[PDB]
């Protein structure tokens, strides 16, 4: 929990970059990483600190709260939250093309959301 799974560093030292960098930790299993190690964009690096982020193994739909039907569980390209295609309104029959930003991110980030330009 107090070490980055990817570089084995900690909050005091990112071993890849040499800089101090906060860890983000999965709210369910404790899997931790530096945001840069997790290869998050600066927008996502920021977003995962504003809510109880979950790693891919633990990720649940933010709407229904389940981790079932992973073949329909979208990840927002800005905040990394999961959403089932069928939980969205309107429901999506097929996955989207290109980048996809959830409603929370569109509201908060506006023009900085991935879906734009
Ligand atoms: Zn790291
Ligand atoms: Zn986890
Ligand atoms: Zn759902
Ligand atoms: Zn989002």
Swiss-Prot record:
Changing residue 61 to W: In CSS7; abolishes interaction with acetylated or methylated histone H3. A zinc finger (PHD-type) spans 1-61, 58-108. There is a cross-link at residue 12 (Glycyl lysine isopeptide (Lys-Gly) (interchain with G-Cter in SUMO2)). The modification Phosphoserine is found at residue 11. It comes from the Eukaryota. Ubiquitous. It is found in: Nucleus; Cytoplasm. Interacts with the nucleosomes, in particular nucleosomes bearing histone H3 crotonylated at 'Lys-14' (H3K14cr) for which DPF2 has high affinity. Also interacts (via PHD-type zinc finger domains) with histone H3 butyrylated at 'Lys-14' (H3K14bu), histone H3 propionylated at 'Lys-14' (H3K14pr), and histone H3 acetylated at 'Lys-14' (H3K14ac). Interacts with histone H3 acetylated at 'Lys-9' (H3K9ac), histone H3 di-methylated at 'Lys-9' (H3K9me2), and histone H3 tri-methylated at 'Lys-9' (H3K9me3). Interacts with histone H4 acetylated at 'Lys-12' (H4K12ac). Plays an active role in transcriptional regulation by binding modified histones H3 and H4. Is a negative regulator of myeloid differentiation of hematopoietic progenitor cells. Might also have a role in the development and maturation of lymphoid cells. Involved in the regulation of non-canonical NF-kappa-B pathway. Belongs to the requiem/DPF family. It is linked to Coffin-Siris syndrome 7: A form of Coffin-Siris syndrome, a congenital multiple malformation syndrome with broad phenotypic and genetic variability. Cardinal features are intellectual disability, coarse facial features, hypertrichosis, and hypoplastic or absent fifth digit nails or phalanges. Additional features include malformations of the cardiac, gastrointestinal, genitourinary, and/or central nervous systems. Sucking/feeding difficulties, poor growth, ophthalmologic abnormalities, hearing impairment, and spinal anomalies are common findings. This is Zinc finger protein ubi-d4. The chain holds residues 270 to 386 of 391 of the full protein.
